[PDB]
């Protein structure tokens, strides 16, 4: 009935993992979800630490294994596809690699409602962000957060034709502080760009987040009725209200199409 929704989340990992908690909150609303792990920065350090997964999405694209062979289970049982080890350009794929890409995302799409793409790199990441239906920019009260958010909008706008962005204030100590953050970004993008920002809201500063982090758990899973978790539920409600991709339900063909061109 509905096409698969695809959301890219940029920023927001104060240890506060927005993609994982959004995925859990969406599942709690009855959506079938999956995470795509596209944090290049993290992957690069992990290589030196021997932390690279044995198999990744790149291996599926190369036809070495199937999608089900690379799935990991994260907090609350959310399924994760490792996707930050690609050394190949999504626009210089061979027919064999293209077929592997189609296969990977066909398999990802099976019985799926929402794919959440987690990213942290200004590439072989950006492909996933540009191809996503919605981009969720996570911003906080740290000094460089707003300018980092801006620099990313500038890049996606100028280099990848992207013109609309969702903005979430993470761990804001008050609604006013979240509003100020959005007001600043709006004023700056107003002057230099022609883009449309939309303010999703605030994940409130919450001691439960640290408490969950120290237990190596996601706050939504550990403490589903803490203030931050209730805010993630509300975000998840907003997210299921964003427009779906403009095509009938298929097997994520639209996303693969965007990855390889445009």
From Swiss-Prot:
One of its GO terms (cellular component) is cytosol. ATP-binding allows dimerization and subsequent antagonistic effect against FleQ. The keyword ATP-binding applies. Disruption phenotype: Deletion results in up-regulation of flagellar genes that code for structural and regulatory proteins, leading to the multi-flagellated phenotype, which shows motility defect. InterPro entries: FlhG, MinD_FleN, P-loop_NTPase, ParA/MinD_ATPase, YlxH/NBP35. The keyword Chaperone does not apply. This is Antiactivator FleN. The lineage of its organism: Bacteria, Pseudomonadati, Pseudomonadota, Gammaproteobacteria, Pseudomonadales. The gene is fleN.
